[PDB]
Amino acid sequence: TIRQNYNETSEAGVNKQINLELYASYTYLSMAFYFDNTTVALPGAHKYFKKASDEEREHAMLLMKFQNQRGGTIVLQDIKKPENDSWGSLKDAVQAALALEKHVNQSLLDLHKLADSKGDAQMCDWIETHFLTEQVEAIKELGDHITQLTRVGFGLGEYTYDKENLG
Amino acid sequence: TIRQNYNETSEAGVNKQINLELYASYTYLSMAFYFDNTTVALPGAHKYFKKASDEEREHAMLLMKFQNQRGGTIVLQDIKKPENDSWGSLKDAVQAALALEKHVNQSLLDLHKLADSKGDAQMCDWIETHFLTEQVEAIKELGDHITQLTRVGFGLGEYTYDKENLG
Amino acid sequence: TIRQNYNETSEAGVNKQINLELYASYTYLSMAFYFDNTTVALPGAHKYFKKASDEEREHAMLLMKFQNQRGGTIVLQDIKKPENDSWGSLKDAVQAALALEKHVNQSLLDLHKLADSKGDAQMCDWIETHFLTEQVEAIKELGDHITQLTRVGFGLGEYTYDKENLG
Amino acid sequence: TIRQNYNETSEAGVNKQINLELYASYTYLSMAFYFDNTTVALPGAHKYFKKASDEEREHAMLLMKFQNQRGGTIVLQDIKKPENDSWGSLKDAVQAALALEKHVNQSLLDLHKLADSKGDAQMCDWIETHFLTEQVEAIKELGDHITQLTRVGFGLGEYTYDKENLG
Amino acid sequence: TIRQNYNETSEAGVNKQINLELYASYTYLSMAFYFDNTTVALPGAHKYFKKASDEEREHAMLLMKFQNQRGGTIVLQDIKKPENDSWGSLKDAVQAALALEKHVNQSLLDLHKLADSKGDAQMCDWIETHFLTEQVEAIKELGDHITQLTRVGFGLGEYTYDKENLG
Amino acid sequence: TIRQNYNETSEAGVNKQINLELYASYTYLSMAFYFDNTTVALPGAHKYFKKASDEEREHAMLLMKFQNQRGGTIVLQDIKKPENDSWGSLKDAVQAALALEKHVNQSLLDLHKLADSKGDAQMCDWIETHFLTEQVEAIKELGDHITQLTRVGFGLGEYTYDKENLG
Amino acid sequence: TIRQNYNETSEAGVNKQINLELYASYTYLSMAFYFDNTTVALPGAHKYFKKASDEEREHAMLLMKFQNQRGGTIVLQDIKKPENDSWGSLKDAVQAALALEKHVNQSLLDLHKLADSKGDAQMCDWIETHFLTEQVEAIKELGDHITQLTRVGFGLGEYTYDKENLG
């Protein structure tokens, strides 16, 4: 028996967070191929959101690994389809990505507070080390892109920022 | 308009195959991390079904890209959760994968037959080029794994084939 | 006698397609040197359409080679002058290139359907392998350029896309 | 079970084409060592037809492999002895090979036609990918050798082509 | 004076954990040379448990270093002799080590809990950074070895795992 | 305005020479693939007249570029099909090419005489620099090929000079 | 808005710590150039406290960056001048630095306790990661320098430790 100091509601929250990072993986994939659509056509954003979808999928597998290491049982649910089919302008899509990563951050903070309430020192530091500082950086990066996309405006600017920054 | 000789029924099956390949990616991920579970503990299979999950995910993006190249529209649906939570013995899982890649093959074949009936020569060759011959080889490999897993038996055999073959 | 399973109307269609790809070679050359004209002056487009004229000329020689390999007889006709003398804005010229490559695609699809009706398995796969997927990619690429040229607008944008993309 | 969309008359055709490609291997061997005979003594042809024998033997193994991938059963038959013991002039032997690869081509086309009649999309592409275009090129090459061997005539010319071309 | 926010019961706990990590070092040494004994003769395990002994001895020195950095006083005690003289089957010994690192884990958690109760933020992170996550991975690894050693069974299997895995 | 000392009659002859060089490119292409025809089968000449077609096409773009550099306007006309469909013997074709490059020379000479009569010093040197001395060498080479093709005779000779000289 | 789980009192302490670390940078600079003064003349310490000034300045920018990453607002205040103009003996200065890094530690600890009380898990780990364990090591090093400076005495000793240790 490897399980030690690993609460059962902790275990249930990791199962949830796994679903959330998969849901995020699938939302970014939806964005990536929206900018590959011929009537949108921003290759840099295609690149940028494909990698994002790769990363939160890593997130999920890092949480899957942690579940096994602590001695719990992975339990999967349906990954729900993304909230939209099309994503508007390049600025609109980065605003949704900001809203999405803030939603993920809040869950990671709730999981941390949960783990903390049950005295799980290791699960706290694991979440601090793999997710919390990286979320903070993800959020600040998106925040800067939104300021920039507003600064360059529409038309020529949207093209330029796609190519020269997101790619 | 880039759309040419691309039938709306073909477009809908593509979306249907995007969901299917994503479904297979999510099943393999389930298996991969079942073999990482401490009570199962087969690192070779864990490695083997993790790559398999990557492949059918690559399959989905290859279809997403093709939907865009032909001037269609991606429409995503939920990714249903895997049929099982645990996957039994190493031989039991390889059988489970054989049944899945056959299901996907029949689906890819029906999608070919649909495309052919609408006169879509390029779609036919594209499915032939990227999917039909790969499925044949994938099924043949699963079959040989099943035969070899039966030859090596349970216990020491299952270990050996895990490390030496799938690893 | 090398001729085997090679229909006489097939042979007549290859002779036609040779003329069409030459006509396309000559249209792109007309575009390439229109952007080299001092009152137009977009060097990137000059590059971009010179290479296009090189490529459909390869197309012709690939069809000439196939004619000989199958045992037919190449028969040449006049290459007709391009439909226009000047080609308008950079966006206007890429729209004509989209119309031209769709016209070529349709002929390649008609030749395929023709070859198919006469049971010519090899000529079908030859057309699938050298022309059909490449046409699909050519069309999607042009489609994206047209979206982008509309996005960046006129003046500064037209210059920027010429230099940073087409060159 | 791995067999899927693999019809029993297709499987019987595959067994017939393994025998024919082995039969062709054995004719080419016969010729290659005819030219090694001291009353003939054409070292270039020996080397050329030895290689062609390796070639159609690789064909046979390629088909045996395909039979196993689809879940068929290889069933072998006697390989009949070549039609002749000696092969006349070098030009006579190249004409014998042209006739032979045309027979193989027709047989390969009939196998495709049967595969297509049962809706075996994958079998059709496999034959297209590995055999149909390679047969066209081999036939054209033999055709060009026959024209060239007529051009150089007999005596000194036959010597020259053997050494400078077939070697 | 360098001591700062370093409480006396924390300092006493550090002295207790130096003894325990030295005790663990000395158990692993006992096992490693049990497997070197000619009636046992498992060279992989000898090498694996020798290294684990070096390991928990590095742990001890890491803690002695920490005691000095905070301005504590190292106070050493006898290292008790391991609980057994011989360690049964290889699987028996891996079970003995699992039990041992769990004891160390619980002790390490209690030390964290005490450090946190006195508000020693730095002591908590130090234990998180150097010990807590490493203990989880060691426990999971021992757990996986125990499942695998059951899988290969006794006799030939025990031989194989010793050489191919622990070595 | 960049146009200086560039007479309108000179401008029109340039367009007339663009057509002529394109006409020569299309003739050589016709010859090149006549020698690739299985009943003719002279790979050396095929290679030789393919390069020749590339050269006079380079000639046309060199004239197109010069029309633009002097501030004129390209006006394209049809490219007439080659005078013959087949080209007889290897010697017969080299004679056909000699007659063509002489025609092109007289045309280039008349274009020089026209430019000189209008006082266009730069155009004169440009034609001298890029065309007059190249035509002299091209004609001299064709002449030597004709003399050598007559020396080597028909049959074996024609083969030999094809492979060893034009190849 | 990027601001999430970032309390306004935490924001104000960050600004307060930016000032403190800048204050320490300006103190070390004062010391560094006291040891460069001709009547003091200890190049090793000059080098040692110049680097120390660089470090706590790096500390301030690391806090400035963190204020921005969390969506707060930098507010700068005066940097007060160092407590002394001269710094006495080499041992006297190292004691002065030990008192300063302890002051900064208590400040960093209170900032941690403040962040923890407002539930800011990421801020806590960030301070742990970048500051708490570095301060422990910095204080331990100053302590050892003080002990060594007392062992080597005044005069020749002070020289020796300056060049051989701080240099």
Author numbering:
A (entry chain A), B (entry chain H), C (entry chain A), D (entry chain B), E (entry chain B), F (entry chain H), ...: 3 to 169
Excerpt from the paper describing this PDB structure:
Ferritin is the main iron storage protein in most living organisms, playing a key role in iron homeostasis and detoxification. Canonical ferritin is composed of 24 subunits, which self-assemble into a quasi-spherical nanocage with an outer diameter of ~12 nm and an interior diameter of ~8 nm. Ferritin has prominent octahedral 4-3-2 symmetry, and each ferritin molecule contains 24 C3–C4 interfaces, 12 C2 interfaces, 8 C3 interfaces, and 6 C4 interfaces, which provide several potential pathways for metal ions and small organic molecules to diffuse into its inner cavity. Thereafter, we introduced a self-assembling strategy by designing π–π stacking interactions at the shared protein interfaces involved in two different kinds of 3D protein nanocage superlattices, which is referred to as key protein interface redesign (KPIR).
As a further example of the general use of our design strategy, another AfFer mutant named P156FAfFer, where Pro156 was mutated into Phe156, was produced, which can also assemble into both BCT and SC superlattices. As a proof-of-concept study, we introduced His/Phe at the C4 interface of AfFer and created 3D protein nanocage arrays with two different lattice arrangements, including SC and BCT. As expected, crystallographic analysis revealed that the designed residue sites are involved in interactions between the proteins in the two 3D lattices.
